[PDB]
């Protein structure tokens, strides 16, 4: 029932209403998600990182979506089968170095097996608290905005 475009637009809406991306941002992300897939498989649980290369970006932010039912994403690397994604990290990077820092931080946090197990059961407030604590401890992540309304379940 939940498509890729629905996920992209739902994760982009709070960034648009808070003034950190332009309106067309989502419409471009979808486009890039067709040409540059962002599907990742980390110990069964799938992860997607939709983002742009700085276009339509006013400030840095993360938008987290927790899919209760997996949605198929084309893999970052080639495979005969796609990736059943349950966790989506919408990335709004203004410069290339910000995008690289956020990508490295996401790579570091998705390998956390217990944290990825907790992400699929905690509420929005607890996910916000955990991700805020993990962002404050990262010296490369600070400068990226993260609010309570940047986390949502899509069931």
């Amino acid at each position, epitope marked *: 029932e939940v498509t890729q475009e629905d996920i992209i637009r739902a994760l982009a809406s709070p960034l648009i209403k808070d003034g950190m991306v332009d309106e067309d941002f989502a419409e471009y992300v979808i486009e890039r998600e067709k040409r540059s897939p962002t599907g990742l498989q980390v110990k069964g649980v799938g992860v997607a990182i939709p983002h742009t290369l700085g276009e339509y970006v006013r400030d840095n932010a993360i938008s987290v979506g927790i899919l209760d039912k997996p949605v198929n994403f084309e893999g970052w*690397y080639q495979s005969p089968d796609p990736v059943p994604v349950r966790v989506v990290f919408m990335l709004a990077g203004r410069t290339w170095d910000d995008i690289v820092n956020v990508l490295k931080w996401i*790579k570091d946090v998705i390998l956390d097996e217990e944290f990825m197990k907790r992400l699929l059961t905690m509420s929005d407030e607890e996910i916000y608290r955990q991700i805020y604590t993990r962002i404050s401890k990262a010296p490369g992540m600070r400068g990226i905005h993260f609010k309570r309304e940047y986390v949502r379940h899509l069931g």
Partner: antibody
Amino acid sequence: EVQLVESGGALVKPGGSLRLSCAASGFTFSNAWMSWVRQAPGKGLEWVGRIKSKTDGGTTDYAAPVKGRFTISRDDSKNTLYLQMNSLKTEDTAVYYCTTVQTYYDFWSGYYQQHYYFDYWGQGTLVTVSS
Amino acid sequence: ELTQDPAVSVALGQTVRITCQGDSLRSYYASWYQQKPGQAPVLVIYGKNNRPSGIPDRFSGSSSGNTASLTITGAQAEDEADYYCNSRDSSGNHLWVFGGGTKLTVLG
């Protein structure tokens, strides 16, 4: 759905000028890096030039056998790419394709190099430089 | 610069390995392009081993040191075409260089 149509291929005298156009459809042309590639009769692919988007500076780069004679411009409002060619020579006789440029980078490797490639190609227009 | 074999033969149904040689391939992936006689080049392999839109899974890409190899498993008559490799040459020579191209011939 992505369509790139070249136009402007005609006969031109050595030392003359010629402007090739390429109309783009099926994608946001404003955010796409564009490139011109050429292929001489019976030879291989030779990258002519490249132009970036306005978000990345709109800068332009050319190949050595083209520097000082060719120019690459773009009208994003018309979704059109232009290649102006001056001081033409017989070696410039070739089929010219307009390609779009995409980028790729690794995630797990730890290194984040950008590797650009040409994923969408037009059918090309033939420029003949003869007297 | 990038170096390819000018011509390569393969039996119908067998696996062929066309290779691209260049120093820059030590630190950059190569992109591969197929050009059938009178048509325009099409992208078949980009990055480590990625395929676009609707490209058959018979095409695979690999990199080992200073070489990059496009691997066609189960050759067919429609593969009889020219294949070009592309990567960033050295540094400030140009920016994108194509190999001389390999003319694939499917025999039987």
